[PDB]
From a paper:
NCgl2760, MSMEG_0317 and Rv0227c, which we collectively term LmcA, lack significant amino-acid sequence similarity to other proteins, making their function difficult to predict. Previously, we identified a new membrane protein, conserved in Corynebacterineae, that is required for synthesis of full-length LM and LAM.
To gain insight into the structure of MSMEG_0317, we focused on the periplasmic domain and produced a truncated form that lacks the predicted signal peptide and transmembrane domain, referred to as MSMEG_0317Δ (residues 30–323), using a M. smegmatis expression system. The N-terminal region folds back and interacts with the C-terminal α-helix located just before the transmembrane domain to form a closed structure that resembles the shape of a ‘cone with a flake’, with the cone being the β-barrel core and the extended α-helix being the flake. All the loops connecting the β-strands and α-turns are ordered except for residues 129–154 within loop 6, which connects β5 and β6. In our MSMEG_0317Δ crystal structure, the electron density of loop 9 is well resolved except for the side chains of Asp226 and Asp227. Loop 9 in this conformation is stabilized by a number of van der Waals interactions, including those of Tyr224 in loop 9 with Gln181 in β7 and of Ala228 in loop 9 with Tyr292 in β14, and a hydrogen-bond interaction between the main chain of Asp229 in loop 9 and the hydroxyl group of Tyr281 in β12.
Residue numbers in the entry: 36 to 128, 155 to 327
């Protein structure tokens, strides 16, 4: 019965650490990889047209940046995603499928298909137990993309040049520039791959994802299962202020759902 509201406008930040290619070393003598770098992953979500009684469209801008740099520097990743979803089920109507940014109302202790926009497919978000988050009893879900349930790199996504985003899907450079073994001035072509793992903490009543943990791994390799050079390898978790903001938003949605449900009954 409940519907996703049309006034969603959120800005959520997840802090963590990464190993990443320094964008400013692109034309240097060697590709520079910075290790154990502090990062912040920011997600801006707003409602856009088409949105009506049946559907809601969300435009989501995601950026990853170094936090030991001022605002004009340390820019690592920047992605935009747009999805139209059913307001009652949160399922998608690039073509998306399943859940994308929210879980359904009255979320159950079961598996849900959860879209990964880089993999361009839904992967299972498996129920993993209950957990308290700031006084709210949440359901935990775990999703693996390119990793099998045992956490082993198994089917990482190979980037297409059409959807390579900010970095080339295929890169040719000297072994010396890549920093890998090779013959003198050997030329090596590597392809970029992607694998990720995420945990979601969900309010079962509103379906709001109040907290998330995300591990994203992008790397260059000649063979998918033998990574050679990291492009970005990050692990982030929703920060305390953003968790508080989502817990407050979920609580306000629960209060409105409760008011409407009680009015429909006696």
């Amino acid at each position: 019965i409940a519907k996703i509201p049309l006034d969603i406008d959120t800005s959520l930040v997840s802090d963590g650490t990464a190993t990443a290619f320094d964008p400013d070393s692109l034309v240097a003598e060697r590709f520079k990889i910075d290790r154990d770098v502090p990062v912040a992953l920011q997600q801006q979500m707003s409602v856009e047209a088409p949105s009506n009684a049946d559907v809601v469209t969300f435009q989501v801008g995601t950026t990853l940046r170094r936090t030991d740099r001022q605002q004009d520097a340390g820019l690592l990743l920047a992605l935009v995603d747009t999805v139209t979803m059913n307001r009652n089920t949160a399922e998608a109507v690039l073509p998306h499928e399943g859940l994308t940014y929210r879980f359904p109302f009255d979320t159950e202790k079961k598996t849900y298909p959860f879209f990964d926009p880089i993999a361009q497919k839904a992967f299972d978000a498996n129920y993993d137990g209950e957990e308290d988050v700031n006084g709210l009893t949440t359901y935990r879900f775990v999703q693996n993309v390119g990793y099998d349930a045992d956490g082993k790199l198994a089917d990482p996504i190979k980037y297409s040049s059409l959807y390579e985003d900010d970095a080339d899907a295929s890169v040719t450079a000297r072994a010396e520039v890549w920093g890998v073994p090779g013959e003198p001035d050997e030329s090596i072509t590597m392809d970029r791959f992607y694998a990720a793992s995420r945990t979601f903490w969900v309010d079962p009543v509103s379906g709001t994802i109040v907290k998330s943990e995300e591990h994203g791994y992008q790397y260059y390799a000649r063979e998918a299962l033998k990574p050679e050079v990291t492009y970005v390898d990050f692990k982030v978790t929703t920060n305390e202020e953003s968790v508080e903001s989502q817990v407050a938003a979920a609580s306000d949605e629960r209060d409105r759902i409760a008011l409407w449900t009680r009015s429909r009954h006696h």
